[PDB]
Design a binder for this molecule. Structure first.
Ligand SMILES: [Cl-]
Ligand SMILES: [Cl-]
Ligand SMILES: [Cl-]
Ligand SMILES: [Cl-]
Ligand SMILES: [Cl-]
Ligand SMILES: [Cl-]
Ligand SMILES: [K+]
Ligand SMILES: [K+]
Ligand code: NA
Lengths: 123, 124, 124, 124
């Protein structure tokens, strides 16, 4: 049995850089995974994807397409003060938020700014 | 499943007052995502139990969206319509601006997308 | 919005018993904050859904304070009055000493402040 | 205790509609765990208070599963049966696939295991 913190660190162990769209997706996947008691199936698929030769980014996308809790799941909204509060490595990954964003379509999270503006983090 | 999506819809419609209400829309959303996630039997069982406990059928539908995993943080479907007049009369006092990332278990039943591009959230 | 602050107030008043009660004051608090935050349609839709679900209108108003974002961390408005007599009769039995950081979503509807400086919180 | 398992079962059945419902099965489940954990008196006291408060007897039973310690992390008992036809008629619309780690306090009342090895969960 793996904890949410331990699984997040395993995933971070593989990812290049820091504050990337993929780091955020790790946090999203571990939160929904913990809350749905899906951490072990997530862990097992992540390990098999890597063994099969997938990039760790692609292992994470495969989890969102395959693990039942991500079926139809919408991204969380993260309240922040201003756009400068979004990690640098996320700054070229932001796009207008559609009506009904889904994580398994690549909408990782939505930033909502203090002025009301929303910016969708997109892969 | 012991129960088809069509038969479950009809059972739920059997208890709901009126026609074209926000709760009729929610029945349709529930049966669709229930069919697609192979959840129809659990949804039907919970609906029956809520009624036996004395819940209104409206309350029974809300409980499904809180308790069945496919509805947890679920993106509501987008329904393409020509104009605001295409939304059923009984849903017309339930429309609101769509927030970022609406969730069905937060009362966002569906999003109507107008031809001109505008959206209206159906809210309970 | 699809509904004005006045019209929404009147719809809520249509379902409340009595006159000058703590819940009538809450309707005023909700419609003011809703107007100022462009939330009247969401508030209206939630009130309609609560009534359809079989909730009392009083519970419907409490639910709005718990679910509509503008009420999160919201302090009760201060209403400046001349004497205890300026408080509507049906509210006189709902007054309590005001704690350090009162919140609407914890049932502190408003705070009456007398000319002498004394304060009484309207509590549900 | 003040009350035997049989007498408690009979008190609960006194208040339940019908025969062979999912809530009758839940009574049996509650009385067996209560007897084995010496919890019958706390279960009786709570059932009585829920009825006094105006709760349906079905809600009263659900609250016991949420409040009484023995039901925490408690899995539904497995009931061996020959075929689906041996499940009482009033439970036939409450059957669903069994998840890993089902919990009584999440509404999995029991699990029926058929002769051919298939399993069906009784759900509220
Ligand atoms: Cl079907
Ligand atoms: Cl079928
Ligand atoms: Cl109908
Ligand atoms: Cl919002
Ligand atoms: Cl008055
Ligand atoms: Cl709130
Ligand atoms: K790194
Ligand atoms: K009976
Ligand atoms: Na979900």
């Amino acid at each position: 049995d793996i904890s949410a913190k331990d699984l997040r660190n395993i995933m971070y162990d593989h990812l290049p850089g820091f504050g990337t769209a993929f780091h955020q997706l790790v946090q999203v996947i571990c939160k929904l995974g913990k809350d749905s008691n899906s951490l072990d199936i997530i862990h097992a698929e992540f390990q098999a994807s890597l063994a099969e030769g997938d990039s760790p980014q692609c292992a994470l996308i495969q989890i969102t397409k395959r693990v039942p809790i991500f079926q139809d799941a919408a991204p969380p909204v993260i309240h922040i003060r201003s756009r400068g509060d979004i990690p640098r490595a996320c700054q070229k990954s932001l796009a207008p938020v559609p009506p009904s964003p889904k994580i398994d379509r690549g909408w990782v999270c939505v930033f909502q700014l203090q002025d009301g503006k929303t910016l969708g983090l997109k892969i």
